[PDB]
Amino acid sequence: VTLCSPTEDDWPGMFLLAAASFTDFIGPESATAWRTLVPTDGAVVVRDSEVVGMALYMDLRLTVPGEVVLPTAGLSFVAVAPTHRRRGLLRAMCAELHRRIADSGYPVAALHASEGGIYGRFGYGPATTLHELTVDRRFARFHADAPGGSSVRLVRPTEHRGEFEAIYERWRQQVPGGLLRPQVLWDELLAEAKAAPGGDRESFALLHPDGYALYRVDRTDLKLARVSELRAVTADAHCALWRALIGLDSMERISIITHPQDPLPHLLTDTRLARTTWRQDGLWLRIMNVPAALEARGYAHEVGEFSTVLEVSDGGRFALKIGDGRARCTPTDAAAEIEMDRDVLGSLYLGAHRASTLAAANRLRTKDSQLLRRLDAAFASDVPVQTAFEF
Amino acid sequence: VTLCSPTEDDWPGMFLLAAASFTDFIGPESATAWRTLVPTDGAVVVRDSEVVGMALYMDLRLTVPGEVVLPTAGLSFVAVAPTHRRRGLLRAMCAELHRRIADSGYPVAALHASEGGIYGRFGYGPATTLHELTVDRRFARFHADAPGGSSVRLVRPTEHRGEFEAIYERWRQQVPGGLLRPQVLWDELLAEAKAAPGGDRESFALLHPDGYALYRVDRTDLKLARVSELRAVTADAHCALWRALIGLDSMERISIITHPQDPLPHLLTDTRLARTTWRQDGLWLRIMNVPAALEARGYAHEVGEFSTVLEVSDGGRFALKIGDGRARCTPTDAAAEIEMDRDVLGSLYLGAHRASTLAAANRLRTKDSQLLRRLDAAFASDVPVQTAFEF
Amino acid sequence: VTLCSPTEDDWPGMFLLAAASFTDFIGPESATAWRTLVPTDGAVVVRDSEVVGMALYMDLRLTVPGEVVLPTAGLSFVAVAPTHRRRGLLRAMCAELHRRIADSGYPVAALHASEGGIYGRFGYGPATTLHELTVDRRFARFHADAPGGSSVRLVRPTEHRGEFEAIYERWRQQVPGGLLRPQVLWDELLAEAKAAPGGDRESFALLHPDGYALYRVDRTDLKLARVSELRAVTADAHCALWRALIGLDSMERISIITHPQDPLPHLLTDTRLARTTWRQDGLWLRIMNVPAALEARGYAHEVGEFSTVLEVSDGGRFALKIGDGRARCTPTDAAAEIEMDRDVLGSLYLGAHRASTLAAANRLRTKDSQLLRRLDAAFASDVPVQTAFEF
Amino acid sequence: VTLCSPTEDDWPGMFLLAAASFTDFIGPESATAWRTLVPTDGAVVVRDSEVVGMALYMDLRLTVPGEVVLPTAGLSFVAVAPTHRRRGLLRAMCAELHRRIADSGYPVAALHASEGGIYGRFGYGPATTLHELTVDRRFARFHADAPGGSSVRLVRPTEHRGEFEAIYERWRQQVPGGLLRPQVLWDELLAEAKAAPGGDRESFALLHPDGYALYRVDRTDLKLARVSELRAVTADAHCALWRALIGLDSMERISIITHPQDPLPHLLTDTRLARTTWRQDGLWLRIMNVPAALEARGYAHEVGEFSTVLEVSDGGRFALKIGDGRARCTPTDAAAEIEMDRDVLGSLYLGAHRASTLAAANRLRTKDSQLLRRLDAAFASDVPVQTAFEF
Amino acid sequence: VTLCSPTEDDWPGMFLLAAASFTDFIGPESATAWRTLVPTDGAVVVRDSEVVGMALYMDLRLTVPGEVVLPTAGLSFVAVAPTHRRRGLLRAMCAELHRRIADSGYPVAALHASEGGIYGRFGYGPATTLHELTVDRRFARFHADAPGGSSVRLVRPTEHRGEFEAIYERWRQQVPGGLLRPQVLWDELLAEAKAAPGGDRESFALLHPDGYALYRVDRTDLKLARVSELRAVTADAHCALWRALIGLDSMERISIITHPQDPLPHLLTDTRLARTTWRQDGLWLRIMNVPAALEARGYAHEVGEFSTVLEVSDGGRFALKIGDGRARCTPTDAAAEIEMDRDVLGSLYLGAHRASTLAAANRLRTKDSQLLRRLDAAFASDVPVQTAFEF
Ligand SMILES: CC(C)NC(=N)NC(=N)Nc1ccc(Cl)cc1
Ligand SMILES: CC(C)NC(=N)NC(=N)Nc1ccc(Cl)cc1
Ligand SMILES: CC(C)NC(=N)NC(=N)Nc1ccc(Cl)cc1
Ligand SMILES: CC(C)NC(=N)NC(=N)Nc1ccc(Cl)cc1
Numbered sequence A, B, C, D, E: 001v002t003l004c005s006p007t008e009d010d011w012p013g014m015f016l017l018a019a020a021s022f023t024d025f026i027g028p029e030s031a032t033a034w035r036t037l038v039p040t041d042g043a044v045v046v047r048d049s050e051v052v053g054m055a056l057y058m059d060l061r062l063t064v065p066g067e068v069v070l071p072t073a074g075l076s077f078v079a080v081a082p083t084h085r086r087r088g089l090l091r092a093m094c095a096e097l098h099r100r101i102a103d104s105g106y107p108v109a110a111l112h113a114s115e116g117g118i119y120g121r122f123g124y125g126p127a128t129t130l131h132e133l134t135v136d137r138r139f140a141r142f143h144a145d146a147p148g149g150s151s152v153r154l155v156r157p158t159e160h161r162g163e164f165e166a167i168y169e170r171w172r173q174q175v176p177g178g179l180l181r182p183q184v185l186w187d188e189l190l191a192e193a194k195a196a197p198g199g200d201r202e203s204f205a206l207l208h209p210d211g212y213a214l215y216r217v218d219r220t221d222l223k224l225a226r227v228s229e230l231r232a233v234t235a236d237a238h239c240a241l242w243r244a245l246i247g248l249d250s251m252e253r254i255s256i257i258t259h260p261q262d263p264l265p266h267l268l269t270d271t272r273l274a275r276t277t278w279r280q281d282g283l284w285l286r287i288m289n290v291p292a293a294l295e296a297r298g299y300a301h302e303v304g305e306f307s308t309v310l311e312v313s314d315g316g317r318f319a320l321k322i323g324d325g326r327a328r329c330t331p332t333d334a335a336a337e338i339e340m341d342r343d344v345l346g347s348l349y350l351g352a353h354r355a356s357t358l359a360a361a362n363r364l365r366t367k368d369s370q371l372l373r374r375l376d377a378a379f380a381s382d383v384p385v386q387t388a389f390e391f
């Protein structure tokens, strides 16, 4: 077996492995559009001749706490032929891409995991949490305090592309987890909004000056509406869109994949009607350069200046000083006050997981409980972390 | 209809309403043990003659952030006959008990809600969150970092009552949400640990010096073990008990009703195996005396001294100064900087809900985003809020 | 918001609201064929610019007891945008159409209800009952008395359109509930008889000189045949078609949406094999002109001449004389002997609901039990009321 | 009603009956390809004018024990209109085809039965057994002894047609139950390997020099892979293909319709993971000429020479001598030592059913237990009987 | 941890581990009756003080092909505390019991496996196959050939204990897999035949001079009868009992756990009505002494004398001569012609698995296909292998 950058002649072999590996593999046409986000030298293949393994990264822009946008290597299209399992192909492909990503200057890599048990050992930690809420809209009444007690329009998505793009662009710059959505991914999204013979029903949109929701009736459950994406830049827009969704009088239930701090339940007289039906890891992060990542993000202003020594397992030891919402992270050989594997740092990085929770599992080790409280407070995000789109 | 404290002659009428109202109504014997926690004048009935409504409170001790224990009026046994709906009986009974609770000197009242839409309008806010985790133990492997890589014993619960009582007593004093469990409730718990003809299977216990788990196989799904209660005072005890539960080799699944910050998922190589199968409000709080409650709890040391003016809707306006982890809360007629209904304060009080999340639903109103960040940080609990036992 | 007859420019806005409101919305092509049944001034829209509400009526011909055919305004395509709920749009649109229908000379309006709780307050009463029967054909044996112990042919529907049209035309003139089916609706029916990729299987027909059945195998349950429509003008035809349907030896079950007096169960040695799997209101009626409707239908010859005074709530008081199967219905200020809301009269009108049943719910009020027996007998239909087709 | 060979003018009438009778009826195009396997005079129709019954046979080649290939009449496309049940059409059509098959010189006829209770009385006995195995691949580990501890390639079926044809051709000559697969059936198979809108997902192939597997992900259960066909000429190929199928890491389950002696379970450390989820009769046989069939197949060499007298109910009495793996079967009027109906002989013929098992049901009658043991041993097949393809 | 024979003081500790390990653990009373089958020194415990592991064997009598009865060590009550997994306790307990069993003179050990992946590596091979058949009795018609076209009585089990014992005793001596059922196990069986509050319904019996069936209606599915045990010594008795079971006119379905050669399906006009709903390994065998086991059983008379050399992996090499239905098995250092692990021999031993099937998985290795055919024929059982009762 050999590992190398694919030639044009490798891509049909890659698309066969993709079709056999991914049920959501639209086809070679969709694949060729995503391919425009893959840099030169962003892809590796393993050949036995025939393609038996592949992996690549896309050039992404990820928003982190403090509204800072990082260049991010988005791992995707990772697959090993069912004929070639347990031969170290995944480890070899991840080692080569990680070498290329680090050499190229990316401070972070990111992925969506097909299973929970793979990517930890390669230094990825789950950094966003997906939370599905299902509302029994038949009983849903808005609280007396809820805003907006007709700013929303029901529209055809393909006729309002410009407005969706501009709202999304405002949203993604404000929210940790936000990703820049390039033109080719808007092309894909609006092509999926069409009804397909034997497939999805037509998508509709609810459009506010400061937010939109895209939804469709479920293929088989005709009383369920699924919200594919709701992006609101203001609380007024979020509440106005939910008032419209709860007005889908022919549905029994509205479901959305959202984040744990979605204020929806608080909009209703019965908080219990917004039921959590599913929870899962969303975006995973591998911190490629510990000092560049820790100095780049903003920190909570509420915690007073403090200094510590952080060791990442096989990733350096650093003097970490955090104050006035900024970190300075410098090499040191001083004794470590905090130790953790690289994956744990990625889990902390967008504020989705508390240092004290990881400490209670012994994933993060310190003898100082005051230092733990300070890290928890500092790494917290003012704006709750959300998940942009899967890749 | 008349509202009054019940006489001894009213109790058979109350037990009939209870049997008709509550499916979990063990019987008059269990009821008579809980009755020892009801103070003189802790109960009201409505008569049409026959009992058509009832409500009472029990004397409880609730742990709040800072390890402070508050006298708490636990509302329970609330029922209105199906013959007497929509006649204002619940509002009349809650108004009278709230008068008695406030006059008696309780700073807080608490309940478990049969539905989500009732108790908000009486000033109760959901203050703890129940989180059911279901583990597919067949795939569960402990992370290399997990502690305890035989401190636990498999025992009969009724033979180790003293040890369970002492561990629980340590747990409940340390954790916000903790409740003192009186002798009569230990009597009930150990009577429910017995197998019943046509009912529950036998409970077993896993016992560590610093924690215990009580579990039983499900009545009908013989491959599911349900953990009824796991109380761990140390991280080592928590991990050791889960190692033993994952060693129940005849089960496919282990389920527990826990809290959102349970570190279990982080103990495993695959965090996704600890699946969230259910989430719901647990304990609800009504703040009866705003200054006594806000001055009693401890606050985060990480936030610097700040002053604000808080108005509770029909519950006073106060100068609120928070610093060095303590609050001072004094009458003022100065302009309000923060306004919220009483129920919202109860939701904030144990740190389960963020001020910024309630603000995004307009349940809490301020024009100062810096003040919101400061309240979020100050009201946060170092020790995650848990739910003790239902009542 | 403004209410008006739509211009040609409004129809794309109406088709967007329709797609978002109705899951069964084939598309703009099907819509344009139904549109040929809508008279000039048969449609209203509400604009905010954009269409946020719509309603129309079609010109129909409804058969009532005595084989009398009434011009009928069939309400359809009624929808309010999810953005515009609770603003009185439905009440405003129904008030305007009802004004136009009454002014145009229609004695009755009719609809199929999307939910049971809407149309009562606008004067519509459920007037036909849908009854789904599911037969376990594996056990079905015909009684010794059953007729037809090969008059039926298995055919392709599109090749026998003329014969279906002529049988249906005989059926609809004989049966209360019958509707004239115009050419455009035969076009639609035969287009739905085609198999669709990802959709319905091919329909087949069973054809007798005096009846037909259209059926298809269910999309997903391949052992269920669904009869979409069985129209039999004679008992011999009805029994012959069921003999053929019970001969679908590859099916386990045959289901049909029929009426409560379907004689099918009586054809079998085991009446219980024709199981009632679903029951629901079918056609709803609003009596627009009380005297024109009550004088138009025929009444049971078995009841002797009687006179009464009927008051319809806000719909007039009338001297009602019924004899020799005919009614005379004239204005009076004499004291009322019978009172009911308009919706109740529509429920009585085709004989689907008994006066004595509505009296027992206090929907119809009299102090005379003899008068109730006389109304029950008079309003009964000799020929059981059936449901023609949905609109 | 009349029975005759169809004219070209009958075929549209036959295709209508086929569409109404068979849910798996691809269409007239697929039907016209299978039609090339039907000999002149291989088809009968019943007319009432219109086609109300049909039956035909195809020219097949069936492998029997000893690697002997018999000309076989494959009954197929048998249907009676639902209008014409219980009129003896099936018996009349089977009697005429059986006359033509016997006169033409076929020693055996075969079919796949739509139900288990029809074909016994026409002399067909179930001769192969279908066994569905479902593997929970997440737990599947190969035994230390299992062969092949990368000979297999993941390929697109349509690009390797030549290789599939050559492996299948080797398989079908070696295994009892094997059928020659003509070019038109390879055309059909590779056309079904394509994804269909609203239908099947794309098929992939696993290709070894000495075996192949064709599989697809299930339409609706996206964690189930269904193996449509696995043909392995060697044990090494069988194990190598299963290693690759168990490497489909995105599936939970792999299902296959195989035979009772599939060695798969023995390849795994946990034999129980290969679960039997379904069992059913596969190919049915009617022995048309008792001596030609019994002399044609090979018998077990392990049993010593023996002689008996076999009577088939209304099918002759024969002196049957079996030795050195060969039978001689000659007319006799000597007393019968063994008696059975024709269907029972067909059940014994490929070794799928034991003589002693049929004797215990009194389907085969002898007074000699030693003769039963000898027949069981002689009729056993060295190579386990498999099912080729349905027709 | 220490391993030793338990004292009387250990048994309460063993019964706690048993209750926690086995859901079917009736209680200490049932346990004390089974305990009478455990020889002195038949039990081992591991102590940490407290019991953390246990295993024992019972003295059984197992019928093998040729109606030979072997003393058999039945392993049972094997459990390791969930606190003590992965410490080699099971391997240590099995090694000690196997030492004691071998020293005591048992030629074979046997068990029922809680999972399929444990006992292989300790030399146990699955030797019987459990086959659940579910009959839709509503369609079941007996074939014209079926025997018995009133020898059976419906009786109360507890009144006919003597007759059940005598039939079972005849059955168990005739059938490979048969076990002697001691008086204490008849006591248990007849105590389980009683209805329990919240548990099983009453059992009834069908009693023939030469067979019995015990059955009960399912706890929850009131249209399912479960046959717990059917023992028939003659084909006439087997058919007569099934005629009576198919006469349970209030049931839809009759289920039984039987063996793969049950002739039931052949008794019916539709063989497919006896559906295989479940298949699993039953009894597992460990051959403790290869020559004593191979010389003890009878072999097929149909195969001519042959000689080979068999090597069992770490269990000896033997000259194996089989002729006239008897084996001679003597030490040799000649080259092996056949090799297999000990577990494989146990799988072959009662005739449930074919040598050629195990060879195709490479669990049995020879270069001689003629030798494989001879072993398959020789190890076959004339009387099909059945499973007596679980332990
Ligand atoms: C929504 C998700 C599942 N879509 C993706 N998986 N992203 C994706 N398919 N990514 C991808 C990237 C590059 C190429 Cl060349 C081909 C595919
Ligand atoms: C575990 C919960 C549901 N148990 C309770 N509901 N508490 C409870 N039943 N409380 C209660 C309190 C007082 C009396 Cl007199 C009777 C009953
Ligand atoms: C079978 C039923 C549901 N079909 C209808 N709903 N009727 C219907 N769609 N009616 C309708 C009438 C007029 C117009 Cl312009 C557009 C649609
Ligand atoms: C895979 C099976 C179900 N396919 C078949 N049934 N065979 C089949 N359809 N046979 C067939 C034979 C001849 C003619 Cl003309 C038309 C059809």
Ligand SMILES: CC(C)NC(=N)NC(=N)Nc1ccc(Cl)cc1
Binding pocket: E024, E031, E032, E034, E035, E038, E056, E058, E076, E077, E390, E391
């Ligand atoms: C029917 C089966 C499951 N019953 C058994 N497991 N046998 C069993 N429990 N055996 C057993 C043997 C000895 C003792 Cl001391 C205690 C129990």
